[PDB]
Design a protein around this ligand. Structure first.
Ligand SMILES: O=C(O)[C@H](c1ccc(Cl)cc1)N1C(=O)c2cc(I)ccc2NC(=O)[C@@H]1c1ccc(Cl)cc1
Ligand SMILES: O=C(O)[C@H](c1ccc(Cl)cc1)N1C(=O)c2cc(I)ccc2NC(=O)[C@@H]1c1ccc(Cl)cc1
Lengths: 96, 96
């Protein structure tokens, strides 16, 4: 989360089928996570498939990728935390 | 429009306050347009403010532009025709 209220970073959530598959494919193994954990695994993911741009590393390109289907965009910046979060929020259910 | 029938491109619409200002900001001067015209002005806007990705030209990076707020995305592909129509529709009222 970095600059997302730490309180919000610990928010307990249940990823929907598509996001859950993304997570487990990189090593995750629960059905319930904290936002901070999702970001972490989503972080490994980006890193392993190298969805980042070599010369412009803070920009991710997920056009022809499963991530692109979850987020619904061809690219985003890892510097804009609030936007990534809301993009992640649509692929899960917040456990109350 | 494209991938979208001509019957749909000619649909009559009334942009909402923000999209309207957006349109008039690039030379438009009506309060009601056809989808085809909105796309055209929106095309000039994108081009005029150089919002296209230099190395992935089919991607409109509108993250830090008012266009980002209206479309609700940090970016989008000009190949996703139906998605663009949807984003535009949310910003207007179809003149019945
Ligand atoms: O570790 C961080 O603090 C940072 C981060 C950036 C934005 C947000 Cl919302 C949370 C965390 N982050 C990265 O900088 C990062 C960037 C790339 I390019 C690749 C991996 C990576 N690793 C991270 O753990 C996160 C991160 C992971 C997934 C996503 Cl979608 C965004 C950022
Ligand atoms: O001219 C077209 O047929 C095409 C177009 C693409 C998608 C849709 Cl839905 C309608 C029209 N189009 C562009 O390819 C385009 C691309 C860029 I990058 C910049 C301008 C541009 N000009 C256009 O007239 C359109 C277009 C304009 C605005 C938007 Cl939001 C999307 C496409």
């Amino acid at each position: 989360g970095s600059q997302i209220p730490a309180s919000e970073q610990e928010t307990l959530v249940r990823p929907k089928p598509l996001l859950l598959k993304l997570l487990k494919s990189v090593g995750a193994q629960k059905d319930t996570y904290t936002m901070k954990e999702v970001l972490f695994y989503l972080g490994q993911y980006i890193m392993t498939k190298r969805l980042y741009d070599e010369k412009q590393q803070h920009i991710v390109y997920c056009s022809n990728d499963l991530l692109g289907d979850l987020f619904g965009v061809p690219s985003f910046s890892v510097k804009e935390h609030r936007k990534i979060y809301t993009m992640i929020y649509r692929n899960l259910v917040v456990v109350n």
